[PDB]
């Protein structure tokens, strides 16, 4: 009935809130930032064993230094990833430097409210966790369909986002190691999903300060993290 | 204005092209394929700026493939020739494709089309674009028999290409010659 | 003078470093090899701004394709991207003479690209005012079964002779050796050091 | 009708281990006529770099305005001032954005990078970028270029390490080169804006030049 | 021009238009794509054709390119538009890049067309799921991507779209093998469709693309032989 | 946004805006057409809103070109839009081809315009049905174009108020071998049946395509003569 | 309710209910206080904290060398408005070489939002700005509203908890004109009760606009 | 505001474009159009929408020649059918201009169907409430008959029927249609189907016939020819 | 020049209830003979033929645009386009390109539908149409044809005599035009049949 651009009497953008709900319906993704980098651990919802897990990607390498992990509508997150990649390469071309993590996050969020009626028809149904290395510093941001990016040290988006926040509230510390960050991300993901966490149903990535690179973990690295998990 | 020659036979078309590409006075390559196989049935010899012949070849081959995929059928040699002529006429009105072509084809029957940059489409038994048309025509005229055997046709094409090599001042280092027949397009060596 | 040749050991790309507007040498340290991908470089010949901007833009497009798609972008693909971008400016008086050289799944590849839209695959190319002299060195001294040192020296010497016989070529030969293992920036050698002053014929 | 005036005036940049000295004559002249005698052609762009421009003054002003707006956009959207490398790339891209209607201006981006090192970039009107250690632009570029080549011998031996001079030795090289250019170039003179970018930042001196 | 937000989030976070496009896909006929190391087989159920209907050149299977097969389930005209865009895109990729478009790239493009329709104001979503399959190169593994009306795409070892997608997918999961041969993949697809076709020889059609080959419709005799071997 | 069709199919597969425009036609003033052997006639009730109205300033029977004439039943203003469009189309046809637009081509252009307004967004259908008379190779031809852009030929017709009774009256009274004189008399009679009160020459407009192939609008004097003959 | 569907629809009482909904969006934003003196202007905002491990999302922004905006409401709308403000600043500097005035930026923002409400299909900016700028016209504080109007304030409080801050500003309103920059920062901090969550951008007739957070703000937290 | 927008290019809960479904209903309430593909050609036979003693059968209401090789029959709104006929004629002539070849029937069908589908999927405009029986000839598929509906979905049919009582015509065609029919046999079958599912004046016919030397010819039977065909039945 | 790029020679002629339209068969690229099978005369309809003299490019472009237009007009009007109506169509097609003219000059030879009267319509490149009752000439042999036909044309030529002058009056013109010739083809459109006679011209 009412336009997608309608504000609710409370003052909330109804379509933005509904897109946030769509995000809440997405696969769980946990970004844990440690002084040694930042780790994405996202649930891959393998609906079938014939589904190629490598093709079901929530983690996208925006650039060599920055990447994103999605929660919600995978295609909308794909469009946001396309914009972020174009903008990271455009920044590299325009300024001969890697795009800042805040810069690329803000760039993708400027596209979030670009929907309208009477441009996009609707908000993005995907929330992002953008983690990267800017000038040797690990940065992590979370973007919701509202286009509100906030820098995070430990965030979770998707199905168990509230539960993941509750778990991290007393599990995340600011002085963890990269190994500890991996353990915390994978554990929070396991505790906020409805399946078991193996190297095939989880996608892990690291924006690493040591290498200054956003590398999505191979199967062996995910297996190592899974094995090291205490439970 | 590179040398491309064509020789339609009873059931084949020998389509030769200057195989040497040059950057001004420098012969950059000696095996450059100027006969763009638009289809398994059609080889379009092109004569002109290498970068306009490449772009026209890519467009024409992509449109032939698009016709074949969008419509399950393939373009006829006449239909493809007229599509190329339509492209060239639109261009010459807007931005001429400075590419003179010989469209050899075999859609069940051999076809050879003179296709100037303007959009002059003409079915020919033999022909040439470039300055080689001033050197090869008489050869063909003096030696083309109706119903040539493919080997007699190869000898005739060798005759025309040797005429280019011997009498054309800007003589190609060599030619890439392709046979377009019921077996498709095959790079044949005239020896 | 830029040049790039494929031999059994890989691609040797040797470029001079002279930027000359008119008769004045504006630079002798300009970088005429631009790395496009880990295993692929592009050479610069013609308009310096055109060559460097468009090789940089080709690098951006290659990176965009790399991040967008798992399928590696071949050297043929990079050359085709660059030649389509340059043909987009056909009639704009761009001046790019480049060799997109590198290793892909199919092995070594050199594609000479120019603003005119030409895209010629080959095992041996030389672009620039001194290209004829570098060709004189390459076509004569080139062997497929050269050593890495011999091939790098062949490219270096072709560029050096082009610099000697070409006013528009000079500076230092930057020699890169591309293999399946990536682009190896062999070295920058001053052609002044390469000149044999014992010899008196040239 | 050529949309330029080809004003003239010479700029000379010399980068050092921790400094970049660009000295440019301030004369704005064309066709044997001096429009201005003090038209600063070196501009502090941010806390990291300065841009010297020679050539058409309208294009110099247009390009410097565009670069100032670009740097302001960068500082707003990144919360740190654009680095000399980023400003140099932006200068290249801006000059090439007018590739077919060029800013007939030669640019020297002289600044200090995040490492504290002096970075000098020379450009042509269409945006070729040379990361160099000394450059000359303008009507007296031909006069000054051999002077810097002698001072550094980089042209003579281009693979030898750049013989970086003291900040004051670079300032004196630029001053002497500008004085020679002024003695021989009719479009160079009336003053030398000798700008120095160090870790301390942008420091501008004015030196009288022959006004004939 | 018309730019209404046809696809918009519902209060529960769903794009109901995408759900209706999925319903259109379901009302479409069943397709099953299966992969052997050197082959890709797409078996599509022919719609119930009377004696008066021409059974040639109306298969749901299509070749996006000499290396890309396509089949669809859903609105035939929506899929026709998608296939036209996909073929134009394969040729456009050949033009821009000498390389043939990777199956990931073309599946991404088609799914992005669907995503744009779910994002474009005034555009109905494509009521079409597309099994886009092929080989990136000669040495590349066969790929079978499934792109949905939502614009999401995922690679599959074997997938089904359209009506009976549940049943055909269950058959695929029960009968899939890691290293099926060309004959085994053909049998898998043919049996998976046989479970939900009134007639085997008539209602079922097959098209296979072997490694280093183009789309190839199964001979009626060979198709019958495979059907009888399965039964 | 504007460009959404307000003429849309209803549940029964009916364009309800089309039926609404046809209703507007059915309240738009009786217009009659009668195809003679040697011509065609388009008469129409032209009862002015007031006697102070100047008849010639707004005539329902109009000439599209030398050979094609048009009357309408429905909204006078969008009939004038249709008429300007048809005259412009026939002038364009003459410019392109050196002859007046054929009767059937004028009819097809009117139908195309009406259909366009039935399909494009932001507009309603034309609230006029046109009776277009003109000659063709095979003889005179009366055509009806509906608000929907559906056109078809007629031997006799009525479109406006009380057009059902007028069409029944034409079914009863129309004959194939009528002359243009008899077609004009039939059109006047049909108007009389569809009109209450004294039906005078000033209250009706008659256009005729006769043996000459040219369309002419009968003046009030000619209409009076026909009434009194 | 039925009139609350478009920013283009007036209600029978002459109100644009969608504009008021965007206003309520602003009112539900984090507290933001602005103060004005004869020579300095300050905007102190309690940056939102979506989570305990999330750095407070910045709300005090740097627009022009002497103009800064505190955005309260939809952050993405505020960022789009800030891009528009950068365009206006860039065009003013291009045309005249001087920094645009915060009053002119407020006028442009008001016009943009009013356009967003005067045409269907486009929506009012859910964000409200507190723009402080010290230019030739002096220090000036503007509260730009989603409806497309701005109010020039000596002081103001917007967002949640704004009533107490507004009352405090009213109490010390007559003090602000002559208050020193440090005194003005202190007044802003007092008026704006949450430390790390509080950014504070201060501009002056001489000093450019600069943002202080946490440690930089400690000297004035008191 | 879209308060009165019908969302023509919008899916329904069932996944159907309601406007397209209603267009299909409109067609099903329109005059029957039958296509029968015989050995060399296709017989299209439609029921005129506007009939009566006072109607003049000067032109084919439903039959429209698209090109020398393609003819069409219309079921549904003859107005938007005429629009799509103009577009089909222009597309066939554009193909002839580009390729100097007669447009293949399936391509012309695809073009009109892409127009219909573009109206079903974009623009918020009502779909073309017309179903076409496009008979045609091309060297690739010989003689063809295609049924196209407002969705833009088309299919080849040896014989088919649309419009009023299209199911009864379909059943009769199933019962009596045979392959390798002659022109006379297919015309007789079409007349029989039309009469059994419904007068020469009301009916109109168009025979596409391919002769080896004369090529493909479209002949829309006039009133007298249709009267003779009916009297033969 | 581009008008003489493809040497052309088109000659329509009026007889007694019969028209002729002849053309040289050469496709020449300036001074080079590419083909002797070039078609410049095209049947527009049974009683309209169009000889297009000029750029083979524009010959085919205008023949196919006119075929597009005439096919559409005959589909819409369900009747063949009249020679006068086709003349106006050609005039419109050529003046639509007034600022970028086709380098083709048309020669329309038809029989009027009713009286079978010869109808000649020659125009310049932009559609300035003459309607000679004797003969229409076009192509690089234009002046040659004008002179030979002005002397040669006689009223009431029957199809045999009409063909005889079309052939002779075209042979004389092409054999003086270096770039046109290489055989001729004469279409004699009479009230009941079209006789296409390929005539021997000089092949030099
Ligand atoms: C082989 O023998 C070498 N020949 C030379 C000429 C290289 O110096 C080229 C062809 C070379 C290509 C190149 C690539 C990358 C970096 C540098 C050079 N060409 C040049 O150096 C050109 C020569 C030139 C002059 N005018 C034209 C027009 C079209 C094509 C080529 C040229 N020089 C340049 O492009 C100038 C480079 C430059 C760098 N700093 C400068 C400061 C001041 C002036 C010029 C500078 N740029 C211009 O001329 C820009 C003029 C803009 C006017 C609006 O390389 C091969 C290997």
TrEMBL record, chain C:
CC terms in the record's Gene Ontology section: cytosol; nucleus; proteasome core complex, beta-subunit complex
GO molecular-function terms, A-Z: endopeptidase activity; threonine-type endopeptidase activity
Entry keywords, A to Z: Cytoplasm, Hydrolase, Nucleus, Protease, Proteasome, Threonine protease, Zymogen
Domain of life: Eukaryota
Localization: Cytoplasm; Nucleus
GO BP terms in the entry: proteasome-mediated ubiquitin-dependent protein catabolic process
Catalytic activity: Cleavage of peptide bonds with very broad specificity
Chief place where the protein resides: cytoplasm
Subunit structure: Component of the proteasome complex.
Function: Component of the proteasome, a multicatalytic proteinase complex which is characterized by its ability to cleave peptides with Arg, Phe, Tyr, Leu, and Glu adjacent to the leaving group at neutral or slightly basic pH. The proteasome has an ATP-dependent proteolytic activity.
Family: Belongs to the peptidase T1B family.
Protein's name according to its UniProt entry: Proteasome subunit beta
Organism: Trichomonas vaginalis (strain ATCC PRA-98 / G3)
Parent sequence residues shown: 55 to 256 of 256
Automatic annotation (TrEMBL), chain D:
Gene Ontology cellular component annotations, sorted alphabetically: cytosol; nucleus; proteasome core complex, beta-subunit complex
Location of this chain's protein in the cell: Cytoplasm; Nucleus
GO process terms (BP): proteasome-mediated ubiquitin-dependent protein catabolic process
Highest taxon of the lineage: Eukaryota
SUPFAM superfamilies in the cross-refs: N-terminal nucleophile aminohydrolases (Ntn hydrolases)
Annotated keywords: Cytoplasm, Nucleus, Proteasome
Pfam families: Proteasome
Function description: Component of the proteasome, a multicatalytic proteinase complex which is characterized by its ability to cleave peptides with Arg, Phe, Tyr, Leu, and Glu adjacent to the leaving group at neutral or slightly basic pH. The proteasome has an ATP-dependent proteolytic activity.
Subunit structure: Component of the proteasome complex.
Family: Belongs to the peptidase T1B family.
Protein name as it appears in the record: Proteasome subunit beta
Lineage summary: Eukaryota, Metamonada, Parabasalia, Trichomonadida, Trichomonadidae
UniProtKB/TrEMBL annotation, chain H:
Localization (cell): Cytoplasm; Nucleus
Major localization listed first in the record, in broad terms: cytoplasm
UniProt cross-references to InterPro entries, sorted A to Z: Ntn_hydrolases_N, Proteasome_alpha, Proteasome_alpha-type, Proteasome_asu_N, Proteasome_sua/b
Pfam families linked: Proteasome (PF00227), Proteasome_A_N (PF10584)
Keyword Transmembrane helix appears in the UniProt entry: no
Keyword list, A-Z: Cytoplasm, Nucleus, Proteasome
GO biological process: proteasome-mediated ubiquitin-dependent protein catabolic process
Keyword Nucleus among record annotations: yes
Annotated GO CC locations: cytosol; nucleus; proteasome core complex, alpha-subunit complex
Domain Proteasome alpha-type subunits: 4-26
Family per similarity comment: Belongs to the peptidase T1A family.
Description of how the protein assembles with itself and partners: The 26S proteasome consists of a 20S proteasome core and two 19S regulatory subunits.
Protein name from the UniProt record: Proteasome subunit alpha type
Organism: Trichomonas vaginalis (strain ATCC PRA-98 / G3)
TrEMBL record, chain I:
Function of the molecule: Component of the proteasome, a multicatalytic proteinase complex which is characterized by its ability to cleave peptides with Arg, Phe, Tyr, Leu, and Glu adjacent to the leaving group at neutral or slightly basic pH. The proteasome has an ATP-dependent proteolytic activity.
Coarse class of the protein's main subcellular location: cytoplasm
Membrane-spanning parts: none
Family as reported in the entry's similarity comment: Belongs to the peptidase T1B family.
InterPro entries tied to this protein: Ntn_hydrolases_N, Proteasome_beta_3, Proteasome_bsu_CS, Proteasome_sua/b, Proteasome_suB-type
Subunit-structure text: Component of the proteasome complex.
Protein name: Proteasome subunit beta
Pfam families linked to this entry: Proteasome (PF00227)
Disulfide bridge map: 9-141, 165-169
Keyword set, alphabetical order: Cytoplasm, Nucleus, Proteasome
Gene Ontology cellular component terms for the protein in this record: cytosol; nucleus; proteasome core complex, beta-subunit complex
Compartment(s) where it occurs, according to its Swiss-Prot or TrEMBL record: Cytoplasm; Nucleus
Biological processes per GO annotation: proteasome-mediated ubiquitin-dependent protein catabolic process
């Amino acid at each position: 009935d009412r336009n997608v651009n309608t504000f609710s009497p409370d003052g909330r953008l109804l379509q933005v809130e509904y897109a946030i709900e769509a995000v809440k319906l997405g696969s769980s993704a946990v970004a844990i930032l440690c002084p040694e980098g930042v780790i994405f651990a996202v649930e891959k919802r393998l609906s079938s064993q014939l589904l190629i897990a490598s093709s079901v990607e929530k983690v996208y390498a925006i650039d060599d230094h920055v990447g994103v992990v999605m929660a919600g509508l995978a295609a909308d997150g794909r469009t946001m990833v396309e914009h972020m990649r174009v903008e990271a390469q455009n920044h590299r071309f325009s300024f001969d430097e890697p795009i800042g993590i805040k810069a690329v996050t803000q760039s993708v969020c400027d596209l979030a409210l670009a929907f309208g009626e009477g441009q996009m028809s609707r908000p993005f149904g995907t929330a992002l966790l953008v983690a990267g290395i800017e000038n040797g510093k690990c940065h992590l941001f979370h973007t919701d369909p509202s286009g509100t990016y906030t820098e995070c040290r430990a965030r979770a988006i998707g199905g168990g986002s509230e539960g993941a926040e509750a778990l991290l509230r007393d599990l995340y510390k600011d002085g963890m190691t990269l190994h500890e960050a991996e353990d915390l991300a994978l554990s929070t993901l396991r505790q906020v999903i409805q399946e078991k966490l193996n190297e095939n149903n989880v996608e892990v990535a690291c924006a690493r300060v040591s290498t200054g690179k956003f590398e999505i973990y191979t199967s062996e690295q995910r297996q190592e993290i899974v094995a090291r998990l205490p439970p | 204005m590179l040398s491309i020659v064509g020789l339609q036979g009873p059931d084949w078309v020998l389509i030769a092209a200057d195989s040497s590409v040059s950057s001004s006075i420098i012969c950059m390559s000696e095996n450059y394929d100027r006969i763009a196989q638009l289809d398994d049935r059609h080889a379009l010899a092109m004569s002109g700026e290498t970068g306009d012949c490449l772009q026209l070849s890519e467009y024409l081959q992509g449109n032939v493939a698009l016709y074949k995929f969008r419509n399950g059928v393939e373009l006829s040699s006449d239909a493809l020739a007229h599509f190329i002529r339509h492209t060239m006429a639109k261009a010459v009105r807007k931005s001429p494709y400075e590419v003179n072509m010989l469209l050899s084809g075999y859609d069940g029957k051999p076809h050879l089309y003179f296709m100037d940059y303007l959009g002059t489409l003409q079915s020919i038994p033999y022909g040439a674009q470039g300055y080689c048309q001033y050197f090869v025509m008489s050869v063909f005229d003096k030696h083309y028999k109706e119903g040539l055997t493919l080997e007699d046709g190869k000898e005739l094409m060798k005759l025309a290409l040797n005429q280019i090599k011997q009498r054309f001042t800007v003589a190609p280092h060599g030619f890439i010659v392709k046979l377009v027949d019921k077996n498709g397009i095959t790079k044949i060596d005239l020896e | 003078t830029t040049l790039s040749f494929i031999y059994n050991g890989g691609i040797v790309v040797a470029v001079d470093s002279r930027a000359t507007g008119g008769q004045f040498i504006f630079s002798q340290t300009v970088m005429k090899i631009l790395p496009l991908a880990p295993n692929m470089i592009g050479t610069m010949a013609g308009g310096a701004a055109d060559c460097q901007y468009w090789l940089r833009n080709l690098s951006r497009l290659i990176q965009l394709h790399k991040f967008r798609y798992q399928q590696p972008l071949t050297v043929a693909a990079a050359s085709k991207i660059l030649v389509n971008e340059l043909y987009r400016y056909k009639g704009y008086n761009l001046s790019i003479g480049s060799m997109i050289c590198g290793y892909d799944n199919t092995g070594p590849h050199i594609f000479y690209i120019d603003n005119h839209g030409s895209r010629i695959a080959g095992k041996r190319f030389s672009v620039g005012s001194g290209s004829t002299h570098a060709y004189g060195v390459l076509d004569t001294c080139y062997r497929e079964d050269m050593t890495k040192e011999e091939a790098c020296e062949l490219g270096r010497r072709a560029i050096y002779h082009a610099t000697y016989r070409d006013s528009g070529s000079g500076g230092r030969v930057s020699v890169v050796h591309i293999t399946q293992n990536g682009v190896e920036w062999i070295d920058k050698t001053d052609v002044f050091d390469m000149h044999d002053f014992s010899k008196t014929t040239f | 009708w050529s949309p330029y005036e080809m004003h003239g005036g010479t700029a000379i940049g010399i980068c050092g281990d921790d400094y970049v000295v660009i000295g440019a004559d301030t004369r704005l002249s064309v066709d044997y006529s001096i429009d201005s005698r003090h038209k600063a052609r070196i501009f502090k762009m941010n806390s990291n770099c300065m841009i010297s421009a020679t050539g058409f003054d309208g294009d110099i002003d247009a390009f410097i305005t565009r670069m100032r707006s670009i740097l302001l956009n960068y500082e707003n959207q990144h919360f740190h001032e654009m680095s000399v490398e980023s400003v140099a790339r932006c200068v290249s891209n801006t000059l090439y954005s007018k590739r077919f209607f060029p800013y007939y201006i030669n640019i020297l981006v002289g600044g200090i990078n995040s490492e504290g090192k002096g970075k000098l970039y020379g450009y042509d009107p269409v945006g070729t970028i040379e990361d160099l250690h000394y450059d000359s632009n303008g009507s007296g570029s031909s006069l000054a270029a051999p002077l810097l080549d002698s001072a550094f011998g980089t042209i003579h031996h281009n693979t030898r390490p750049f013989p970086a001079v003291s900040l004051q030795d670079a300032k004196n090289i630029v001053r002497d080169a500008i004085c020679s250019v002024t003695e021989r170039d009719i479009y160079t003179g009336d003053a030398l804006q000798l700008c120095v970018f160090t870790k301390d930042g942008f420091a501008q001196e004015e030196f009288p030049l022959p006004r004939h | 021009d018309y730019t209404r937000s046809i696809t918009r989030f519902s209060p529960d976070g769903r794009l109901f238009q995408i759900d209706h496009a999925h319903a259109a896909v379901q009302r479409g006929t069943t397709v099953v794509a299966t992969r052997s190391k050197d082959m890709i087989v797409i078996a599509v159920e022919k719609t119930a054709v009377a004696k008066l209907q021409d059974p040639h050149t109306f298969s749901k299977i299509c070749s996006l390119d000499k290396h890309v097969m396509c089949a669809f389930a859903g609105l035939h005209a929506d899929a026709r538009r998608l296939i036209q865009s996909g073929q134009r895109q394969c040729q456009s990729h050949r033009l821009t890049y000498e390389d043939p478009i990777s199956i990931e790239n073309i599946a991404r493009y088609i799914a992005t067309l669907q995503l744009k329709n779910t994002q474009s104001g005034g555009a109905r979503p494509y009521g079409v799921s597309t099994l886009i399959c092929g080989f990136d190169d000669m040495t590349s593994q066969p790929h079978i991507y499934e792109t949905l009306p939502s614009g999401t795409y995922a690679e599959w070892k074997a997938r089904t779209i359209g009506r009976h997608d549940q049943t055909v997918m269950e058959y695929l999961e029960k009968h899939y093998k890691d290293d099926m041969t060309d004959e085994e993949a053909q049998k898998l697809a043919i049996g998976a469709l046989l479970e939900v076709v009134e007639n085997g020889s008539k209602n079922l059609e097959v098209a296979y693309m072997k490694r280093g080959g183009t789309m190839e419709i199964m001979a009626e005799e060979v198709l019958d032989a495979l059907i009888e071997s399965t039964k | 946004d504007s460009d959404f069709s307000l003429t849309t199919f209803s549940s029964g597969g009916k364009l309800n805006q089309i039926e609404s425009a046809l209703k507007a036609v059915s309240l738009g003033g009786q217009c009659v057409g009668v195809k003679a052997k040697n011509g065609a006639v388009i008469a129409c009730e032209s009862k002015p809103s007031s006697p102070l109205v100047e008849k010639v300033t707004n005539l329902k029977v109009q000439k599209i070109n030398d050979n094609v004439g048009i009357v309408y039943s429905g909204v006078n203003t969008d009939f004038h839009v249709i008429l300007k469009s048809l005259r412009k189309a026939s002038i364009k046809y003459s410019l392109r081809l050196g002859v007046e637009m054929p009767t059937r081509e004028v009819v097809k252009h009117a139908a195309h315009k009406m259909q366009y307004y039935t399909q494009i967004g932001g507009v309603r259908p034309f609230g006029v049905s046109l009776l277009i008379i003109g000659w063709e190779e095979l003889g005179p031809t009366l055509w009806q174009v509906d608000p929907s852009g559906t056109f078809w030929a007629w031997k006799a017709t009525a479109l406006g108020k009380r057009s059902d009774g007028s069409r029944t009256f034409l079914e009863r009274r129309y004959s194939e071998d009528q002359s243009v004189d008899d077609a004009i008399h039939t059109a006047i009679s049909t108007l009389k049946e569809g009109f209450d009160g004294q039906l005078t020459a000033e209250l009706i407009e008659i256009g005729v395509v006769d043996e000459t192939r040219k369309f002419r609008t009968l003046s009030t004097a000619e209409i009076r003569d026909f009434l009194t003959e | 309710s039925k009139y609350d569907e478009n920013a283009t629809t007036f209600s029978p009482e002459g109100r644009i209910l969608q504009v008021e909904n965007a206003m309520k969006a602003v009112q539900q934003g984090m507290p933001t206080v602005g103060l004005k003196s004869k020579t300095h202007a300050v905007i102190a905002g309690v940056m939102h904290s979506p989570s305990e491990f999330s750095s407070h999302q910045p709300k005090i922004f740097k627009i022009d060398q002497h103009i800064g905006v505190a955005i309260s409401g939809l952050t993405a709308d505020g960022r789009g408005l800030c891009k528009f403000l950068r365009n206006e600043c860039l065009h003013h500097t291009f045309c005249f070489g001087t920094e645009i005035r915060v009053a002119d930026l407020a006028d442009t923002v008001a016009l943009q939002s009013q356009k967003k409400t005067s045409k269907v299909g486009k929506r009012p900016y859910g964000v409200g700005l507190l723009m402080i700028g010290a230019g030739v016209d002096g220090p000036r504080l503007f509260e730009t509203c989603p409806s497309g109007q701005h109010w020039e304030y000596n002081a103001q409080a917007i967002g949640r908890r704004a009533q107490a801050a507004k009352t405090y500003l009213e109490t010390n309103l007559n003090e602000f004109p002559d208050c020193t920059r440090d005194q003005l920062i202190r007044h802003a901090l007092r008026a704006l009760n949450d430390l790390e969550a509080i950014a504070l951008g201060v501009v002056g007739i001489d000093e450019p606009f600069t943002i202080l957070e946490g440690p930089e703000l400690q000297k004035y937290i008191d | 505001t879209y308060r009165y927008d019908a969302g023509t290019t919008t899916f329904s809960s069932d996944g159907r474009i309601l406007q397209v479904e209603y267009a299909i209903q409109s067609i099903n309430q329109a005059g029957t159009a039958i296509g029968v593909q015989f050995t060399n050609g296709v017989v299209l036979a439609a029921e005129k929408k506007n009939t009566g003693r006072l109607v003049d059968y000067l032109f084919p209401e439903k039959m429209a020649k698209i090109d020398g090789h393609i003819v069409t029959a219309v079921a549904g709104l003859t107005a938007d059918a005429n629009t799509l006929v103009d577009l089909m004629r222009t597309s066939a002539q554009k193909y002839l201009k580009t390729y100097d070849e007669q447009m293949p029937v399936e391509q012309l069908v695809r073009m009109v169907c892409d127009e219909k589908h573009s109206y079903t999927q974009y623009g918020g405009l009502r779909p073309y409430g017309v179903s076409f029986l496009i008979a045609g000839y091309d060297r690739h598929k010989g003689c063809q008959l295609y049924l196209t509906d407002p969705s833009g979905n088309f299919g080849g049919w040896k014989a088919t029927a649309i419009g009023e009582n299209n199911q009864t015509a379909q059943s009769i065609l199933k019962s009596q249609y045979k392959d390798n029919m002659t022109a006379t046999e297919a015309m007789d079958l079409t007349v029989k189907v039309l009469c059994k599912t419904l007068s020469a004046d009301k009916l109109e016919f168009a025979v596409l016939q391919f002769r080896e030397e004369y090529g493909p010819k479209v002949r829309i039977l006039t009133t007298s020819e249709v009267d003779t065909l009916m009297k033969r039945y | 020049d581009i008008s003489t790029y493809n040497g052309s020679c088109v000659l329509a002629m009026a007889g007694d209830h019969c028209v002729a339209i002849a053309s040289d068969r050469r496709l020449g690229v300036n001074m080079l003979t590419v083909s002797k099978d070039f078609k410049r005369i095209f049947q527009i309809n049974d009683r309209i033929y169009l000889g297009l003299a000029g750029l083979a490019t524009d010959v085919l472009t205008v023949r196919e645009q006119l075929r597009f237009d005439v096919n559409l007009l005959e589909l819409r009007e369900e009747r063949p386009i009249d020679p006068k109506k086709f003349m106006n169509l050609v005039k419109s097609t050529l003046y639509e390109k007034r600022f970028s003219p086709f380098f083709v000059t048309p020669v329309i030879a038809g029989l009027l539908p009713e009286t079978n009267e010869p109808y000649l319509a020659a125009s310049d490149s932009i559609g300035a149409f003459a309607f000679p009752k004797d003969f229409a000439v076009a192509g690089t042999c234009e002046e040659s044809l004008y002179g030979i036909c002005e002397s040669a044309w006689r009223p009431n030529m029957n199809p045999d005599e009409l063909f005889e002058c079309t052939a002779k009056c075209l042979i004389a013109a092409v054999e003086r035009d270096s770039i046109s010739g290489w055989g001729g083809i004469v279409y004699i459109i009479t009230q009941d049949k079209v006789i296409i006679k390929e005539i021997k011209t000089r092949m030099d």
